[model samples]
Target: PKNFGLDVKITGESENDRDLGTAPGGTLNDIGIDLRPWAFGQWGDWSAYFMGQAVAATDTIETDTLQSDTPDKSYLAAREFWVDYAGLTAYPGEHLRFGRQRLREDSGQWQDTNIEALNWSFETTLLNAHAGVAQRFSEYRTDLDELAPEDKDRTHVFGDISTQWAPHHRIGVRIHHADDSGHLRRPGEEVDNLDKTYTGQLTWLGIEATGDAYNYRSSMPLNYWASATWLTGDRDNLTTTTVDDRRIATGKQSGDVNAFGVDLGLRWNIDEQWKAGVGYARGSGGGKDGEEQFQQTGLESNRSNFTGTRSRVHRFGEAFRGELSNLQAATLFGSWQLREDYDASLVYHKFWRVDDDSDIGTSGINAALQPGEKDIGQELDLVVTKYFKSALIRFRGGLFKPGDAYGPGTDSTMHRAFVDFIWRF
Candidate 1:
């Protein structure tokens, strides 16, 4: 059994656009710490572990400096605290666990392994399965002012399975459900409340022979992977109003919600330290008018809009093609290891709402009020690391350019940088 462990890191960054209130163009800092301890020998195939992490940031981005109706500060609450476990089994090589842990599904385009929640995993020679639930207590704060009681009590559930078919072949599937806290109803609005989601996907991995004589050597590159996903759901009981003469009045009924999306990708590991991949994902209607449809809304929102923008003109049901209510774009990315201790990556993404009528606005500003001929964006990330006998140190930076994808009045680029050190014990 493992007794205890610790991971610590800090980062510094500089940006080119300081007028927008992003991390300044000079430098900024962030730090994170994770600690875990385990208890053993108490039960057959049973053990427990406790984990905690904290992150602190500096206000270099303009969004960090802007005043919201809520408390907009420079720091973010990454992980508060949690406990989880493994070792309970009824079948050979199979076990069950539950607790506040981190969960990630294989859909790849929608969710990432960064969240606070409860989860369980099962594994065997041929199969692996995982599922979990989570809630975001912090996203409810409006205008950075105060968080609503209900908004802080949202929740989500997700599950996935992967199975091996051959030495180099595998297949997988996944599903998810979510409920938002900000859903509300008026006195007579006969509608379902809050946001609910149902998403599913299928994936496969394998190696295909490439008919090439020059590349026929035993070391020829021949690995590939792909996946497809679909999502559908609704958020009812929404209320829209018009702004006039310092007063607010409710307008026509905000319609019911529906949305869906699909994603596909392939990855090729040319060598041990270099890889190239490409993917496409598109999502249409879901969530409240202003909220994002997907939970792990990727790095896209982090760069262009800074998280809270209200300019929503595209309805879920109308945004995707008549089939699912979403539009999508393709992505191409590559990673290179310059040396044993250095690496970098770059990604390009394009988003085209299914409906040409879709528009987005926030903070009384209209972004994407009219669909542009093209919505293209890109992200660049780099990291360097040095290892010592007992510890490791790292430096990292990232840049995002949303272009015409966000609602109007929003900035086009977001930059971040940080440095960190890690000690294992």
Candidate 2:
């Protein structure tokens, strides 16, 4: 059946923050919508499909953008144009696709594929494999034309494969390599580096094993998921500066890097309306001059799907300001369905730093943090949400307190709240 259709989604969000940024408190509001019109066709030995989304969302961070996978903002950039083709006398289960699209590669960092690329995948009953080469397209212009170009002309190749040995259990591997041949700027590296960019020859070969038993019908009242990834590669064009013996300050980071992360979670459906969950995640970190620490993706998606956060700790609690690096966290959560249309949730988190020796000594309020304290803080999040067929509304609030790890003048407590609404058709 050759069909034509339309998709419409509208979202609105507002946030209030305290200690989330340098400022004591702040407020932000944003909105976004997706309008897609598409069609499919087949002609004898060939079939084709093309799709596009006319998107309108916030453009700049200064303009209050939120709930986005990646913060590389663009206003009125309604895009995601792609064309897919199949059955061109190729293998039975082989197909080719190309154009500007989004990819959820591994759940987090590689999750953002708003760039253009060519992709191909082969499918089998128990084996699936994919390989692709991708690049980002962007250009900068100055009035005087004097600004040096930072083409960010990166070309990367990635191949992923997985096996189906047991039911609801998957063990997979991924290999990645990128050539940052463009003018991507490597900040703080005027000299003393591997080359022109901070990530000259970055490579990653990681393995992850996951177990999942979910399908509304599976009799698995008790189910869980787990995954782990290890990375080894080199970061080029790193800063070799001496910042008063402070490793936290930017410095020479040119050498072989090692990083690893793990994610584990379990859920129990006591019944249908009540459920409980427990989860934990850890990431390696410690970036200084002498000892090299593990490196993770700086800019990853916000879908909370990474090994670092998919659990309770990600709901509404990030007491300390950071990502999924050099950290350890545990989460406890529970949810209740008030009826058919209302729900309530609560979560708690315990946070700790992986490398206390590499802590930031400088403090905005105090002189420097304590020398041997590794505890970061604790947080509690509470939320109530209501669903109305194709619409939704929710309110979320978080309360946090610093543990025994802050400086002399650090705030004792902080809090944040958010309101969200959305409609889909």
- The TM-scores of all predictions, comma-separated, are 0.62, 0.71
- Per-residue lDDT over 264-332 for candidate 1, one digit per residue giving the tens place of the 0 to 100 score: 455555775666666555555334551233222220111210000111111111011011123456656
Q: Name model 1 segments beyond 4 Å from true.
A: 13-43, 54-93, 106-118, 132-153, 180-220, 241-258, 285-327, 338-340, 359-376, 383-392, 402-413
lDDT of candidate model 2 versus the reference: 0.54
How much lDDT does each candidate structure score? 0.40, 0.54
In candidate 1, residue 129 scores what lDDT? Answer: 76
- The alpha-carbon deviation from the true structure for residue 402 of candidate 1, after best TM-score superposition, in angstroms, is 4.5
- lDDT for each residue of candidate 2 in 1-425, tens digit (9 for 90 to 100): 85576666554444444333434434446666655566667665455554445556563122111212223333334245556666653567676667655555444434343556677777666887888877666412111122112224557777889887777567778777666664433344243222343555556667666554222223456656565767666665434443433322244345666777666777776776677788787767676531244444322332242212212223225323334556677878776765557777677878777788754311111213466788877888776778886766766556677676665565677655545554544
Choose the strongest candidate by lDDT: 2
